[PDB]
Design a protein around this ligand. Structure first.
Ligand SMILES: CC[C@H](C)[C@H](N)C(=O)O
Ligand SMILES: [Cl-]
Length: 565
């Protein structure tokens, strides 16, 4: 009768604005606060850290603070930084429940020590509002240029600026009486690295002097930290796909658990982020196993669902990908691996047919981005086009995430290309469509479900008009799915996305399974020999876990970010 844990594996999700510091006091003279903290890489990767932080009070804390077992503190931050300056702002709000809706005026921070034995030292002034939990800080180097990421000194760059619901925090209480606290903080990194910070404070009226002594060690030398690859989260090349999964998934789970759940037992999503990165997707998978989670919804890109699939199979963990389409993944005899989507093979053949039958252009160019998906899809299509005598002029590739297509654009122009197929994902396609119509090509473009999203429209504007896509059918127009569509809307979320539906269908799949056996093997056996009613229709699977008789369907794309037959 425990809740049943399902892993949902997104990609390049923002995550929550506020961080939970949990706060416990085991004695009158000690406060311990626990932190989870992911950084993000100028790449959209996640570097995961866990903090323990210890406050020593020279005088015992009044009884009121102790009688109020777990306090919860929500904190956000911002950092602008050069190689020499930093500028930082913190908002902090205390509550006694995990549900989110003279005192100090000025301070200084001397923050010094070492990172992988590279000494650093910074100094500078700041202010805050002890009533509201706001603080700000400027900091200048007294040595030279940080040869590490300044986002590693974040959080560590003044809890005397908090307050509790009905008064002063313990931290403030301690400043006003003069007896004070000290702070040890310790950070574990997923990659073995380690950071120690010790904090002493003097008070001079309402001004604070912070001393902060910093020992970091065994950061990998081409890690995010030693490499300055750390950024705030900026939307990433697959944020659209992760967001559509999470949406379809959170609706589904609500709707299931309302209907009473599996057999009394409710489902609980445990969110993970693999960044569609091979290594990270392998960190995620090892964590999934270790967390006792036996059913996985996700790994969205082929490139990251392969590496992940190995561990899951190796561990007796069920994995339904609602999104990864490269046929490789179900072509290696794995038994615990299912799909709520089709394959590049059928997706490239659908295209070629629509080009040979219903377009018939004169001069074809085939472009891809060189990854499994894109090249994969271009080879189907090329092969379909070759067999129907279509006049394919050149097949070519580009790097993912360059913004400059002046070379491809001048070349489609020089060679009077009226049609182009682009195997790949929306960022590159977006720029193509847009830098094309800028240069005044009348060229007609085509893409797979990877470009069939609202972000394509966001990048391209009017250029997106007339783009041809292959994509799953529009199940958001099917009357059964009306209720679901309304709920997504109630939440201001966009239900047209296909991964919303595939994801929703993948949970329903898991549902049917779970209703006999909590065992990952019988589920895969059951599902393979039975049809499930889902938001996509009935869903028979085959013995390698591919959906039987899945047809993508070909659609006209529009600058509004909808799509018609
Ligand atoms: C999110 C899925 C992406 C677009 C594609 N189907 C792939 O296998 O990489
Ligand atoms: Cl803290």
């Amino acid at each position: 009768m425990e809740d049943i844990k399902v892993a949902v594996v997104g990609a390049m999700s923002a995550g929550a604005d506020w961080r939970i510091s949990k706060e416990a006091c085991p004695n009158g003279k000690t406060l311990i606060s626990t932190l989870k903290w992911s950084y993000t890489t100028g790449d959209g990767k996640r570097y995961r850290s866990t903090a323990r932080t210890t406050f020593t009070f020279a005088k015992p804390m009044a009884a009121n603070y102790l009688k109020n077992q777990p306090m919860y503190v929500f904190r956000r931050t911002e950092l602008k930084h050069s190689k020499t300056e930093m500028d930082f702002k913190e908002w902090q709000k205390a509550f006694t429940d995990v549900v989110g809706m003279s005192l100090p005026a000025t301070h200084e921070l001397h923050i010094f020590g070492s990172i992988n034995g590279v000494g650093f030292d910074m100094v500078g002034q700041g202010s805050g509002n002890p009533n509201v939990g706001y603080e700000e800080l400027n900091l200048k180097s007294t040595k030279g240029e940080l040869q590490f990421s300044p986002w590693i000194l974040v959080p560590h760059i003044f809890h005397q600026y908090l307050p509790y619901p009905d008064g002063m925090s313990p931290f403030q209480a301690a400043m006003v009486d003069g007896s004070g606290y000290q702070v040890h903080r310790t950070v574990r990194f997923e990659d073995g690295a380690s950071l120690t910070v010790n904090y002493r404070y003097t008070y001079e009226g309402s001004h604070i002097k912070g001393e902060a002594q910093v020992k970091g060690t065994g950061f990998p030398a081409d890690g995010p930290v030693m490499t300055n690859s750390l950024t705030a989260f900026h939307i990433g090349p697959v944020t659209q796909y992760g967001d559509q999964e999470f949406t379809g998934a959170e609706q589904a789970v609500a709707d299931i658990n309302a209907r009473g759940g599996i057999k009394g037992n409710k489902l609980q999503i445990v969110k993970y982020d693999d960044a569609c990165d091979p290594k990270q997707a392998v960190a995620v998978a090892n964590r999934v196993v270790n967390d006792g989670i036996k059913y996985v919804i996700g790994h969205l890109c082929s490139s990251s669902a392969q590496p992940a699939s190995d561990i899951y199979e190796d561990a007796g963990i069920l994995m339904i990908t609602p999104a990864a389409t490269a046929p490789e993944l179900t072509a290696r005899g794995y038994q615990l691996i299912l799909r709520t989507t089709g394959l590049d093979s059928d997706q490239g053949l659908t295209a070629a047919k629509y080009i040979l039958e219903k377009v018939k252009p004169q001069r074809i160019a085939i472009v891809h981005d060189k990854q499994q998906y894109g090249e994969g899809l271009a080879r189907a299509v090329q092969g379909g086009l070759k067999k129907g005598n279509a006049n394919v002029v050149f097949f070519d590739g580009i790097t993912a995430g360059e913004k400059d297509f002046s070379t491809l654009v001048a070349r489609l122009k020089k060679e009077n290309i009226d049609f182009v197929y682009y195997g790949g994902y929306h960022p590159e396609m977006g720029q193509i469509l847009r830098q094309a119509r800028a240069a005044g090509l009348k060229t007609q473009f085509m893409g797979p479900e990877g470009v069939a999203n609202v972000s394509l429209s966001n990048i391209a504007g009017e250029s997106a008009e007339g783009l041809l896509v292959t994509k799953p059918k529009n199940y958001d127009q099917v009357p059964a799915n009306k209720h679901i569509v309304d709920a997504v809307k109630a939440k201001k979320q966009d239900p047209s996305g296909a991964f919303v539906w595939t994801t929703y269908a993948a949970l329903q799949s898991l549902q049917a399974g779970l209703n006999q056996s909590d065992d990952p093997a019988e589920i895969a056996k059951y599902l393979k020999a039975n049809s499930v009613d889902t938001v996509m229709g009935p869903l028979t699977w085959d013995e390698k876990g591919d959906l039987k008789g899945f047809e993508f369907g070909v659609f006209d794309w529009h600058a509004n970010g909808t799509a018609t037959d």
